[PDB]
Design a protein around this ligand. Structure first.
Ligand SMILES: CN(C)C(=O)OCCn1ccnc1
Length: 460
């Protein structure tokens, strides 16, 4: 039985509006409705992993697992295994996998973050799950962010709190938040970003939706506009949206958007919006292709429609050689030439680097770099040819070229990371000096850059 080099992942997000689901929700798992939909010829082909995020979920874990497993069984005739389930208030994540994957999945982690203080702490936040699938780390975040058209900044703040404080993945990666811990990170939920147009334009918006003319609406979608101004979700991707706004519907039909202010909305308008979203971030030069992104048309118990997205994701095998794991492979080395960090910090401390990778027995600390002043005000930290030679556990190029090196630049004075990034070893050549580059972030905000050259030696 060969180990896979690709899997398919289903991501679902549904705000259930505190109502039980209808008797049939199979269209969700089949990626059928509006948008980028899945070919009918694939309907019986199970995805490898199904990750279901709900918000305003009124069901017990048991009740929802029942419905999910029986839905997938009906579609695929496969009885899925429960990998993980985690609930914060009415925010829930379920991970199901094909039974053949049970012994490929390990290191399962779950966590939650509650957003806001006092007033604003009590129902919003995120749940998440991570695990290893053979040699590949996978993370999944389901967030329900702050509601309301005039709270996009609160949503951005909720995002930064979730990525700082959600404790998933390898705890040995101590300088790195969830946006660097995983080969593939999927972040979905009722993100609650709105179409920012005047209230008086509600009927115009509805008209545009009926004509399937989304362009003048997406140009005002707060998540796209905040992303474009680097205010949120820096270095995440989203597939093009080709489905109608998924909020706010009258229940039991999809023929009507309910946008007018009511006591029940706190006298707020809910103009039709793409509240319900799926984004991802994968390490550089790893295969990840979105194969569906849309909304169902036939599930109408909630004022939201379910959203689906599916992905092809590259995975690697759990590599064993004669040497590592348990020792180094002298035939392998990673060298860095002419490297420097460019930092936005106004501070003057010395900096050193940390290299972290599962291709190393443990993380590697560099000597301090030499600070110089950039021509436009910047701090430039020069490492020249001074960076250590990294000694991987396995030299086989079929392993080593699939790996990644996480870099943290840390203050000598405080040992706090000022910036984190990631370098792919999927090089055009071995034994050859080649440019490398990563942006550096801290709390998911841009803090600088790291660039230089790499020289990778493999056994070939
Ligand atoms: C879509 N959007 C909000 C945006 O900023 O796209 C340009 C940057 N980009 C290019 C590939 N991925 C992100």
């Amino acid at each position: 039985q060969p180990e896979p080099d690709m899997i398919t992942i289903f991501i679902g997000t549904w705000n259930m509006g505190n109502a039980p689901p209808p008797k049939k929700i199979t269209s969700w798992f089949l990626s059928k409705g509006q948008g980028k939909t899945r070919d009918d010829s694939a309907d019986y082909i199970p995805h490898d992993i199904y990750v279901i995020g709900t918000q305003e979920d009124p069901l017990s874990e048991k009740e929802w697992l029942e419905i999910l497993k029986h839905s997938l069984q009906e579609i695929t005739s496969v009885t899925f295994k429960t990998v993980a389930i985690h609930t914060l208030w009415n925010i829930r994540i379920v991970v199901l996998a094909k039974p053949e994957h049970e012994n490929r999945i390990s290191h399962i982690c779950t966590d939650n973050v509650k957003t806001g203080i006092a007033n604003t702490l009590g129902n919003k936040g995120a749940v998440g799950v991570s695990f290893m699938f053979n040699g590949t780390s996978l993370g999944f975040v389901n967030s329900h962010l702050t509601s309301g058209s005039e709270k996009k900044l609160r949503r951005n703040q909720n995002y930064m709190n979730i990525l700082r404080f959600l404790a998933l993945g390898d705890k040995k990666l101590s300088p790195f938040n969830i946006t660097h811990r995983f080969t593939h990170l999927f972040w979905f939920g009722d993100l609650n970003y709105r179409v920012d147009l005047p209230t008086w334009e509600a009927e115009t918006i509805i008209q545009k939706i009926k004509q399937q003319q989304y362009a003048d609406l997406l140009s005002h979608d707060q998540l796209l506009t905040e992303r474009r101004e680097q205010k949120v979700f820096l270095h995440f991707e989203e597939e093009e949206i080709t489905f109608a706004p998924t909020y706010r519907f009258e229940r039991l039909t999809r023929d009507k958007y309910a946008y007018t202010k009511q006591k029940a909305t706190g006298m707020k308008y809910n103009l039709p919006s793409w509240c319900d979203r799926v984004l991802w971030k994968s390490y550089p030069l790893v295969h990840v292709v979105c194969q569906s992104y849309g909304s169902t048309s036939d599930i109408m118990t909630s004022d939201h429609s379910p959203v689906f997205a599916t992905f092809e994701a590259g995975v690697t095998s759990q590599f064993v050689s004669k040497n590592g794991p348990g020792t180094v492979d002298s035939q392998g080395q990673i060298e860095f030439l002419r490297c420097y960090a460019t930092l936005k910090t106004k501070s003057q401390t010395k900096f050193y680097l940390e290299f972290h990778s599962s291709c190393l027995e443990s993380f590697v600390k560099s000597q301090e770099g030499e600070n110089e002043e950039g021509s436009e005000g910047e701090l430039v930290v020069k490492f020249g040819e001074t960076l250590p030679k990294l000694k991987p556990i396995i030299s086989d190029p079929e392993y080593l070229l699939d790996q990644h090196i996480l870099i943290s630049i840390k203050s000598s004075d405080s040992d706090e990371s000022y910036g984190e990034g990631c370098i792919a070893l999927r090089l055009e050549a071995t034994e050859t000096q080649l440019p490398i580059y990563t942006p550096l972030t801290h709390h998911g905000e841009l803090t600088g850059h790291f660039q230089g050259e790499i020289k990778l030696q493999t056994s070939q």
